[PDB]
């Protein structure tokens, strides 16, 4: 199976992970928030939590969200790429 090594930024912390390169983002986001939170908790950092209603997304440096329905590969996210896990509140 193909994999991508990505850097995830969450709460000013970088976390390296190995992710399936072919799955849609949609099926990785909630799973990734849980691994993230495990790492933050070991660092005694407050886990990431849903301010009200809204959507967790993986974002480029400029705020651009990945498409939920496409893979990392299809979106040109490769080894060493960095993504920000961000919550968008619905207001």
Numbering used by the authors: 17 to 107
Task: Give passages from the manuscript.
The ESX-5 type VII secretion system is a membrane-spanning protein complex key to the virulence of mycobacterial pathogens. Key to their pathogenicity is the secretion of a wide range of virulence proteins via type VII secretion systems (T7SSs). The ESX-5 T7SS is found almost exclusively in slow growing, pathogenic mycobacteria and plays a key role in nutrient uptake and immune modulation during an infection. The importance of ESX-5 and other ESX secretion systems (ESX-1 to ESX-4) for the virulence of mycobacterial pathogens makes these membrane-spanning machineries a key target for the development of novel therapeutics.
The ubiquitin-like (Ubl) domains of EccD5 dimerize and interact with the cytoplasmic domain of EccE5 at the periphery of the ESX-5 complex. On the cytosolic side of the central pore, the EccD5 Ubl domain formed interactions with the EccC5 domain of unknown function (DUF), which follows the EccC5 stalk domain.
